[PDB]
């Protein structure tokens, strides 16, 4: 209503500060989903055969099952993060069988649109898909990247990914074919932004800015092409969390002398007075300010005018922006005092709202981990499903995981086709674990 | 426009989350201003005479100048915090000579309206005025209390006082007639909320919630009346920062068993399943969860039904809210596990954006402190004006302080009457300090 619109101009200034008070909206969610079908497995087999043939030629020169983790992740999106505008899922050409495509808020984005160089799209490698989400048409400027196995909890909010005051929120972990990529990107970033002891980010829903990601891609045009070229995840490729966040944390912005002059000129009258010249002297020199420093500043100023509301020294000309921006000694001292800032703001937190649990084929340990998740709910829950799949305790662990998923998120979502009539997944395996224990 | 209103319902849920995304608005600012006029000084003299007479009767039973710091503080309000809706100034009956009362966004609130017990209002004591700001009519639910000597800087935002996620922001200082009040309130709070090693808050613009302050007043009805009764700041009275913040940080909310049942019942169907009973067992007991604990939980549940979608134990009745909320052992274990939470959220930071500088009659030291303020601007700047006023270096320090004020905030505000024509305050005292140095 009009009163709500006119209530943001009810302040003393009379302006509207929606852009500084109402968070970045809209925010979208991007998923990467792959299915273990026969055709895709055959294509992978052909690609591996080609890889082996290439290795043989080089040496001659010398001479399956998913625990429907997308369904529950989408349910978590709808339940805990209901402020998401649209949901994008990137797939080869595959559409989930349970996905309700009639919903306008869910879209399947194939690899034709995502990839730029259409001689690359049979790509079968997660970093290559990860390279080009920011090129999705219709995607909001800030979007959250979900990895199809990470879920939500405790009713997350956009305040958990970005803040207008402290910028994006970076969640880091243990210090630094996937560890090789981390080492390679560490070397590449040390080459550009200098050597720094770096940690690696956590596996969790990552908020990504399209402008920042595009700037990162433009900064390394050749290297991101290697990531896209490789049709199997290589030792040398650029990641998603590590590359984006550390470019965000090490983006250097050159000093704007006009900004210094404007922040000092409180009158906004173009000319500086003795008080503003004195605050220049304070910000430039090191405290305490001896009058020698201020007299030297005025001396460098009177020199420059000769080469190119009354002040105490009668010989000092009116100090406009042109004098300070053209006087080399003053600009040199300004650069030496105002050294390089950071182009992007960021905030660093620990692993306190992140649940990365490792599921290895031990029903007692799996139940223990899931009970730990149940007792203390956490905002970001990730469950890596590396079950042996050839073991006496594979179906039992799958049943335990599905029971945890159905306990956390039981209600079917709006993105799911009307289904699961008489589905009745095995309800007796978890009872077998109960009876054995 | 309507698209802006309909853009908050563009999410997947279809609802509007303005109350969780756009910060608490509106926010007001409250000032306490006193003038050293002849009539007020005479009234103070009469009150002191009465105090001496009372002391004499008890033993018989045994037998001036302000550096216009409100002007510059209001200028700082307009420049650095332009999101304030209205500004309230509480005075005895005094109106500042420079205040533009024709502005609808500035109001003088006398002591008639502020005080509840009109036989108390000739009160001449800062805590007594401080007691009853939350009773100002038209005041917003969250307001900022300015002490007429604290200013702003670095373009403060409502994010610097309150966050929707971590609650109000508490700025604390060195651990604990004003120190006596701190000790007394520490004793009173230790009596109610138990002994705790407490720090004292900083002198800075304090954001105050009227509901929380009213709850604090109701919690100690007798003690806040002593604060209001005393017509001179006494050793025993309740402060503003210390009393409010520590009640905020030690407000205990009793456990809501219905909340536990609702957070566990993911189906929201009223009845719990084996998975939800198991997450109850995880949250109640201590990990790891032996099946003995879960069987005991079901045993306490089957007991209670006798005294008052199939589960593994055939004897367990449907577990609705009534069973768990009426079973004494289960509620006892829930209370023991879910011990007392805190009624209000809060966040703790250090003295990093607070400038409390002490001005004592040494021109070199005053200039050093003001240069330190100039070199590193800080969000909250407080300058205590305890000049000797009988010294060879009083006018010089006043001129230095006024020059700092006019350098920081030179532009006349909207709350100031059109004035200061040919005012020309002494521009030669600071030059005398320059020449002496
Ligand atoms: C993932 O791929 C599987 C095949 O691996 C597909 O499931 C098939 O669906 C068709 C219907 O179009 C059936 O005729 C086949 O019998 C199914 N095969 C199997 C092995 O179940 C489907 O495209 C995808 N399934 C899921 C659950 O994502
Ligand atoms: C599966 O996990 C359980 C723990 O959940 C393992 O039990 C451990 O057994 C060793 C000795 O066998 C003990 O020293 C540990 O204290 C046990 N753990 C706990 C938490 O008590 C069990 O060994 C694991 N089984 C396999 C095959 O790895
Ligand atoms: C504070 O009180 C002073 C008096 O201490 C007042 O200034 C007086 O203003 C009247 C005009 O109504 C003049 O006739 C007097 O000569 C002034 N006295 C002095 C000592 O200046 C005024 O009410 C207040 N002044 C300020 C600056 O707040
Ligand atoms: C006023 O402050 C200055 C510092 O701003 C004082 O100068 C100090 O003098 C003592 C000895 O007299 C030295 O040990 C200190 O190192 C000086 N301070 C600095 C920062 O160099 C001066 O003494 C003060 N004057 C009075 C009267 O208190
Ligand atoms: C990418 O496209 C360019 C021209 O658009 C082409 O020369 C190059 O070979 C492509 N990269 C491949 C096919 O890996
Ligand atoms: C930064 O510098 C550019 C050109 O040098 C100028 O257009 C811009 O206004 C400056 N930013 C400010 C003054 O905030
Ligand atoms: C420039 O200023 C310095 C003082 O910092 C002075 O010594 C020098 O003589 C000036 N330059 C000229 C050409 O006079
Ligand atoms: C406060 O008001 C009550 C009645 O409203 C009165 O009895 C009491 O004396 C008052 N307190 C004073 C005058 O200090
Ligand atoms: C807290 O308890 C009260 C009554 O005991 C109830 O009305 C309210 O809904 C509960 N809060 C919840 C369920 O969030
Ligand atoms: C209540 O349950 C306990 C098991 O925790 C059991 O020992 C006891 O017999 C039950 N009460 C009755 C009256 O049977
Ligand atoms: Ca100026
Ligand atoms: Ca249920």
From Swiss-Prot, chains A, B:
Taxonomic superkingdom: Eukaryota
Outcome of mutating residue 301 to V: In MLII; uncertain significance; no effect on localization to the Golgi; decreased UDP-N-acetylglucosamine-lysosomal-enzyme N-acetylglucosaminephosphotransferase activity
Pfam families: DMAP_binding (PF06464), GlcNAc-1_reg (PF18440), Notch (PF00066), Stealth_CR1 (PF17101), Stealth_CR2 (PF11380), Stealth_CR3 (PF17102), Stealth_CR4 (PF17103)
Documented effect of changing residue 144 to T: In MLIIIA; loss of localization to the Golgi; loss of protein cleavage into alpha and beta subunits; decreased UDP-N-acetylglucosamine-lysosomal-enzyme N-acetylglucosaminephosphotransferase activity
Residues that hold Ca(2+) according to the record: 265, 267, 269, 276
Record Gene3D superfamilies: 3.30.300.320
Outcome recorded upon mutating residue 75 to Q: In MLIIIA; no effect on protein abundance; loss of localization to the Golgi; loss of protein cleavage into alpha and beta subunits; loss of UDP-N-acetylglucosamine-lysosomal-enzyme N-acetylglucosaminephosphotransferase activity
Entry-listed glycosylation sites: 35, 256, 362
Tissue expression notes: Expressed in the heart, whole brain, placenta, lung, liver, skeletal muscle, kidney and pancreas.
Annotated effect of mutating residue 75 to L: In MLII; no effect on protein abundance; loss of localization to the Golgi; loss of protein cleavage into alpha and beta subunits; loss of UDP-N-acetylglucosamine-lysosomal-enzyme N-acetylglucosaminephosphotransferase activity
SMART domains attached to this UniProt entry: DMAP_binding (SM01137), NL (SM00004)
Domain EF-hand: 252-287
Annotated consequence of substituting residue 140 to F: In MLIIIA; no effect on protein abundance; loss of localization to the Golgi; defects in protein cleavage into alpha and beta subunits; decreased UDP-N-acetylglucosamine-lysosomal-enzyme N-acetylglucosaminephosphotransferase activity
Additional observations: Due to the low pH in the endosomal/prelysosomal compartment, the lysosomal enzyme-MPR complex dissociates and then the enzyme is delivered to the lysosome. Between 5% and 20% of newly synthesized lysosomal enzymes escape the binding to the MPR in the Golgi apparatus and are secreted. Stealth proteins are part of a protein family that is conserved from bacteria to higher eukaryotes. Family members were first identified in microbes as proteins that help pathogens to elude the host innate immune system. Microbial stealth proteins are most likely involved in the biosynthesis of exopolysaccharides. Stealth proteins are predicted to function as hexose-1-phosphoryltransferases.
Function in brief: Catalyzes the formation of mannose 6-phosphate (M6P) markers on high mannose type oligosaccharides in the Golgi apparatus. M6P residues are required to bind to the M6P receptors (MPR), which mediate the vesicular transport of lysosomal enzymes to the endosomal/prelysosomal compartment.
PANTHER family from the UniProt entry: N-ACETYLGLUCOSAMINE-1-PHOSPHOTRANSFERASE SUBUNITS ALPHA_BETA (PTHR24045:SF0), PTHR24045
Family: Belongs to the stealth family.
Domain topic, free-text comment: The DMAP1-binding domain mediates substrate recognition. It specifically recognizes a conformation-dependent protein determinant present in acid hydrolases.
Quaternary structure, from the entry: Hexamer of two alpha, two beta and two gamma (GNPTG) subunits; disulfide-linked. The alpha and/or the beta subunits of the enzyme constitute the catalytic subunits. Interacts with LYSET; facilitates proper localization of GNPTAB.
Disease named in the record: Mucolipidosis type II: Fatal, autosomal recessive, lysosomal storage disorder characterized by severe clinical and radiologic features, peculiar fibroblast inclusions, and no excessive mucopolysacchariduria. Congenital dislocation of the hip, thoracic deformities, hernia, and hyperplastic gums are evident soon after birth. Mucolipidosis type III complementation group A: Autosomal recessive disease of lysosomal enzyme targeting. Clinically MLIII is characterized by restricted joint mobility, skeletal dysplasia, and short stature. Mildly coarsened facial features and thickening of the skin have been described. Cardiac valvular disease and corneal clouding may also occur. Half of the reported patients show learning disabilities or intellectual disability.
Protein name: N-acetylglucosamine-1-phosphotransferase subunits alpha/beta
Organism: Homo sapiens
Lineage: Eukaryota, Metazoa, Chordata, Craniata, Vertebrata
Gene name in the database record: GNPTAB
